[PDB]
Amino acid sequence: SRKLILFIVFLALLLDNMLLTVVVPIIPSYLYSIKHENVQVGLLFASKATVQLITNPFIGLLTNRIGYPIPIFAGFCIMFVSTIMFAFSSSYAFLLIARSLQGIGSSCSSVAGMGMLASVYTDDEERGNVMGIALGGLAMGVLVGPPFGSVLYEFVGKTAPFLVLAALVLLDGAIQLFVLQPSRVQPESQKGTPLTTLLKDPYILIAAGSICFANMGIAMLEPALPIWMMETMCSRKWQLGVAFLPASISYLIGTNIFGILAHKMGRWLCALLGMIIVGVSILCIPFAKNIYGLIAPNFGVGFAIGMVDSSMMPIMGYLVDLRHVSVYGSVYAIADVAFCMGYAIGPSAGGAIAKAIGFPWLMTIIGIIDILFAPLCFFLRSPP
Template sequence: MTVVNEWVSGTKFGGWVQRCRESRRLVLVIVAIALLLDNMLLTTVVPIIPEFLYDINHPEAPLGPVRATLATTTTTYPPCPCEIYNQSGSHSSTTVSNIENYNFSTLSPEEEEKRLRHKDLVQETVQVGIMFASKAFVQLLANPFVGPLTHRIGYSIPMFAGFVIMFLSTIIFAFGRSYSVLFIARALQGIGSSCSSVSGMGMLAERYPDDKERGNAMGIALGGLALGVLIGPPFGGVMYEFVGKSAPFLILSALALGDGLLQLLMLQPSVIRQESDPPSLKSLISDPYILIAAGAITFANMGIAMLEPSLPIWMMDTMGAGRWKQGVTFLPASISYLIGTNLFGPLGHKMGRWLAALLGLIVIGICLMLIPLAKNINHLIVPNAGLGFAIGMVDSSMMPELGYLVDIRHTAVYGSVYAIGDVAFCLGFAIGPAMSGTLVKNIGFEWMLFGIAILNFLYAPLLYCLKSPPTKEEKRSLLMEEKSSVRYVTYQNEEDDE
C-alpha cells in the first residue's frame, strides 16, 4: 500500500510539474526573476565601488566618518618662533600663532584638503566609469553570438548558462579586493546578462504571440528589471555601511542559486531547434524601423547610465553625501521606472507605442537638465522620479515593438531581434559610463547632462516613423510598384529614343 501511495503521490507531483512547465505565467516569472537578480547585481555596486576604490587608493585617508569630520573641524597651529624683519631693517624673534596672517599659503589646510579630494574624486570618476561600462561592452560583443545561437539550440540552455555566469560574477564581486579583479567580475557579468536578456525576451515573445498580451508580459518582465534597479542601490549602500562589502554579494549569490534550481526543474534546459527559418541578423540590422526602435532604447538609457558612476561622486563632492544617501538617491528613479513599465505595457498598445516613446524621450531630456540644479538630496527626488518613469515609457513600448516589427516585416523568430534590442540597451550603458568620466573632467557634470538631454530632444521626432510601419506584404507591393515604375520609365525612354 505504501508503494502504491508513493506511486500515486509521485504521479500527482509529476503531473503538477508538467502543468507548471507548460504554463506561460511560470515562464514569465522565471524571466522576471532572472532580470531582477541581474539588475540587482548591476546596481548594487553603484554606491559601493566608488568609495571602496577610493579607500583602496587612499588607505591613509579613507572616506567615511573620520574624513567627513575633517572638513568641518578647524586646524590650529602651535606657536612657533619665527624671525621677522621690522620696518627699520633689524630683525627680532617673535611668536606667530596664526600662520595664515602672514600669507605663507593662499589656501587654508581645510580648503587644500577639499581641493585635493575633489581632484582625486574627478579622476576616480574615469576609472569607475570604465569599470561600469565594461559589463555593457562585453554584453554588446556577446549579443550577436547569443541571438543566432538561440535559433539553433533554443532559449532554455542560454538562459541557464546566464545564471551560471552571473553566479560566478557575484562570488568574485564578494571577495575581490582590487580594481583588476572587480573589473573582471563586472565584465564577466556582461556575458551572463547577454544570455539571460536575449533568451528571456525571446522566450516571452514566442510564448505570447498576441501583440497585446506580449506587451503586457514584457511590461511585467521589465518590472522585474525595474525592481532589481530599485532594490540594488539602497540594498548595496545599507549593507556596505553596516555589514561590509561582501555581504550584499553573498546574499545575491544565494538568491541566484535558487533561481538556477527553479530553471533546472521547470525549464529543463535542452536543445530545441526552431521550425521556421529565422531572419538573418543582417536583414534585421538593415531594417530602418528596427533601428529607430533600438535607437530610442539607447538614447533613453544613456542618461541614467552616465549618472550611475558620476552622480554618487558629484554628490560626495558637492553635498558631502554619505554611503546610504548615494544609494538612496536612485530610489525615486527605480520606483517610477517600475510604475512606468507596468503602466505603459498595456497603455502603450492603446495610445501608440511610438507616441509613448516620443513623449518619454522629451521627459528624459527635461529631467536630465534639472538634476545639476539640485543643492541637496531632496532636490533630486522629482527629476530622478521623472527620469525613471520616462525610461519605463520608452523601454516597455519599444521592447514589444521590436517583436511586432519582426512579426509583420520578417519571420516570427525572435532571438536575433532581441539581441539587437539588448545591443541597443548595452550601447547606452557602455557609452554612458565610459564617456561620463572624461566629460565630467573636461566640460563638467552640468554640461554633460545638458548634452545628452539635447540628443534626446533631437531623436524624439524620428519615432513618428513607427506610427504605421509597412508590413511584409506592403513592402513587397511597394517594391513591385517601384520596379514597375522603373520599367515604365525605361520603356518610355526607349520609345523617345526611337
C-alpha cells in the same frame, strides 16, 4: 501554464541587476586598502556593459541554433559563478573577470529571456504586458540592490550579500532546471533573418535608437551628477545616494504601468511622449539649486525611460513579426545592444565631457538630442 517562464525571466533579470547594483558599495574601499597595503568603478561598469554588448549578437544567433532554454541556463550558471567569485575574490583582476562574466550572463539572460517571452506570448498585447513585468523586475532588482547590500553588510558580513544572492541564484537555477529542462538541443524551425537585414530596417533602427538615447540620458547622469552636486551644492554623501532614488522608483512604476498602458495610448505615442519628457527633464536638471530641485526632474527621467523601454521593447518583436521572420533572438539582441551602447560609454565618457565642457552644457546637449529624436517615433505607428 506559461507564467512560469515569465517568473523565470523576472527572477533572472532581478537577481542580475541586484548583483550589478549590490557589488558597488563594498569593493572600491577594499581595492584602495589592498593598493595601500571613483574612476575604476566606472571602468568596472564599462567592462561589464561592453562585454554584454559584444556577447549580444552572438547569443542572438545562438538562440536560433540551440533554442532559448540552454542559453537561459548558461546565463544562470555564469551568473552563479560570478556571484561566487564576487563573494571570494579580493583583488582587482579577479573582480574585473567577475564583471566580465556577469556581463556574459547578463547578455545570455536578457536576450534569451526576451526572446522566449516573445516566442511564448505571441499576442501583441500580452507580449507588451509580460515584458513590462520583466522590465519592472529589472527595475525592482536595481532598486533593491544597494539597500539589501548595506543591510547585509552591517548585519552579518561583507561576504553575506553575495552568499545570499548566490543562494537565490541556486533557487532560480533549480526552478529553471525543473521547468525549462535544458536536457537536449532544440533548434528553431525556421532560420532567422540575418542581422544585416535587421539593421537595414529603418523602423528597427528607430526603435533601437530611441532606447539607446533614453538610456544614455541616465547613463551619463550616473557618473557626472555626484561631481556637479559636490561642486555646486556641497551636498553630503547620503544626499548623493538619495538623489537617484526618485529615478529608480519612477522607473519601476513607469515600466510596470506602461507595459499595459502602451497598447492603450499607442506605442508610438508613448515613445514620443517619453522621449519628450526625458529631454525636458534632462534640460531642467542643471537649473536645480537643491536636491529638492532635482526630486522632480529625476522622477521625470525615470518615468520617461520606463515609458520608452516598455513601449519600444514590445514594438521590436512587433516589427520583426510584421516584416521579418518570427524569430526574436536577433531583434532582442539588437535591443540589448541599444541598452549596452549607452550603459557602456556612460561611465567612460560622461566624466570626460563633463570636464571638457560644463555639466549643464552636457545635459543640454543630451536633452536636445532626445527632443530632436522624439519626432522620429512618429514613423512607428501602424497604418490601420
